[PDB]
Amino acid sequence: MAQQSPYSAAMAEQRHQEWLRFVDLLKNAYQNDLHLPLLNLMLTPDEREALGTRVRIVEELLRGEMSQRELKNELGAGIATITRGSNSLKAAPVELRQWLEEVLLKSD
Amino acid sequence: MAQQSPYSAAMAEQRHQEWLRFVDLLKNAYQNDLHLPLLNLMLTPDEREALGTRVRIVEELLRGEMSQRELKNELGAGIATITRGSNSLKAAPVELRQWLEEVLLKSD
């Protein structure tokens, strides 16, 4: 049945539980100082450079102190990436925004 | 100056420190239970799904019983994918591989 039906929450669960098994692994690896070896096994040079830049796209989207030129040129975030990062900020919790504001902009 | 030249080890260091920010950020996110929503910001649902699935690719190479056609029908993974898997495992440190051969092989 479920593979014929137009949506299956059993497979949404099966995928979430594939994902949480990854998140537990990484939550322990930090609790054993194995997190950077793990992360280099799990994320590619390009993925890693993209997550480091993502910290900077989101920092700035909380600082609110860049133009469109400056994000296109200095961080490589065009209209599209900004739209999807701005959407994802909106989709987040307030306790997420509030705490990223307490870590990223408290360093200035 | 380094821009002009064939290799920059300064852009390498900048990108490494830009990357190690992400990895201190997410160390402190587990300690607040903000890792779920932080990971949902930093990662598209097809990345989160690749991370989910990448754990089984690392489990099923470390257990060594699945064939190349079994990994292609059940995990999606090509020759390319398993090759890049097996180059990543050979280059992992032994204390990571011994700890993976616990964490993914101690549950069954």
Side-chain angles (χ1 to χ4, degrees):
Chain A
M1 186 163 83
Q3 201 191 11
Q4 184 171 10
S5 308
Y7 171 84
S8 185
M11 194 170 264
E13 195 63 31
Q14 197 178 22
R15 303 291 189 183
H16 202 61
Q17 295 300 328
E18 286 172 13
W19 167 253
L20 297 180
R21 179 185 191 188
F22 163 87
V23 176
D24 257 2
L25 190 69
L26 185 53
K27 180 173 177 211
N28 296 273
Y30 268 124
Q31 298 180 322
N32 306 244
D33 316 313
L34 279 174
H35 40 275
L36 277 167
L38 174 63
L39 280 166
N40 303 323
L41 173 63
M42 292 304 285
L43 300 152
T44 64
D46 329 60
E47 278 162 325
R48 296 191 313 249
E49 188 171 73
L51 281 154
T53 298
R54 290 166 192 172
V55 160
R56 295 197 60 183
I57 293 161
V58 179
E59 170 176 41
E60 250 311 321
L61 287 161
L62 300 170
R63 205 179 289 104
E65 294 283 316
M66 265 201 191
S67 67
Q68 294 196 280
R69 178 159 176 112
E70 293 170 85
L71 297 158
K72 178 51 186 194
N73 296 150
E74 305 199 58
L75 289 180
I79 290 150
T81 289
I82 300 305
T83 319
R84 195 184 191 152
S86 307
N87 298 162
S88 310
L89 272 168
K90 279 176 204 286
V94 315
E95 58 259 56
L96 191 79
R97 291 194 295 286
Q98 287 191 276
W99 174 86
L100 289 186
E101 280 180 310
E102 269 288 277
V103 183
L104 298 172
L105 311 176
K106 199 162 187 180
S107 283
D108 296 309
Chain B
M1 192 184 43
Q3 196 166 76
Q4 190 180 356
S5 75
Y7 193 68
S8 186
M11 194 196 270
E13 172 83 279
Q14 174 219 316
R15 303 285 202 215
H16 196 54
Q17 298 318 311
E18 278 180 24
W19 150 264
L20 286 194
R21 186 168 195 201
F22 178 67
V23 180
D24 291 345
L25 198 58
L26 179 58
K27 186 185 192 163
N28 289 1
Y30 290 114
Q31 295 184 44
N32 286 279
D33 313 281
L34 291 185
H35 59 291
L36 292 179
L38 182 55
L39 290 169
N40 295 348
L41 175 64
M42 286 297 276
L43 303 170
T44 63
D46 334 274
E47 298 168 87
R48 308 189 300 255
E49 188 155 304
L51 286 156
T53 302
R54 281 181 207 174
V55 167
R56 293 181 62 196
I57 304 164
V58 166
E59 177 176 44
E60 300 304 356
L61 295 161
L62 291 167
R63 180 188 289 126
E65 286 292 313
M66 282 172 91
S67 74
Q68 299 171 279
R69 169 164 181 72
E70 284 171 290
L71 292 161
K72 191 54 193 170
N73 307 156
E74 288 179 72
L75 305 188
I79 295 163
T81 300
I82 291 303
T83 296
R84 201 176 184 186
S86 312
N87 286 129
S88 298
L89 292 156
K90 285 176 214 291
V94 293
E95 61 265 52
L96 184 63
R97 300 197 294 238
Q98 294 169 255
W99 176 89
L100 288 169
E101 296 168 331
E102 289 280 76
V103 174
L104 310 184
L105 304 186
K106 186 194 199 168
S107 208
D108 308 300

